[PDB]
Design a protein around this ligand. Structure first.
Ligand SMILES: [Ca+2]
Ligand code: NA
Length: 138
């Protein structure tokens, strides 16, 4: 019972940048393309019926040469790091995976750029562990 969160669907809260569709290979209607600024984020919300460990999978494209690593923070601060190396092209997508603890109830998940390049393009977030559904943005 994984939860797959796409742009333009319940549980997708914000991108500092735009939702774009001009590179092939994404899923849903697009992908998030952040501003080129550190701290630029993609934000989702997840409701968990019980606290407990989840595995998050972030599908992403990085057509630049440099890593564009992310800070992943839950409820404005768990604080995690996500490594986001080059995928070799803006049309090649890979996944980065990270285990986190979610609390029972609402979990605002922010993935933010650690560098001035912003994040790679972010296609989707997948969440596995217990019962999780779209949360409340805000
Ligand atoms: Ca997508
Ligand atoms: Na960008």
């Amino acid at each position: 019972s994984a939860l797959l969160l796409q742009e333009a669907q319940a549980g997708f809260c914000r991108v500092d940048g735009t939702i774009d569709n001009n590179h092939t290979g994404f899923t849903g209607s697009g992908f998030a393309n952040t501003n080129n600024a550190q701290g630029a984020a993609v934000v989702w919300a997840i409701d968990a019926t019980s606290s407990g460990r989840r595995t998050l999978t972030i599908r992403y494209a990085n057509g630049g040469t440099a890593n564009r690593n992310g800070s992943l923070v839950i409820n404005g601060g768990g604080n995690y790091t996500v490594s986001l190396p080059t995928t070799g092209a803006w049309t090649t997508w890979q996944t980065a995976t990270i285990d986190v603890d979610l609390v029972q109830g609402n979990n605002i998940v922010q993935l933010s750029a650690t560098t001035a390049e912003g994040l790679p393009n972010i296609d989707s977030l997948s969440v596995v562990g217990g019962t999780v559904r779209a949360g409340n943005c805000g």
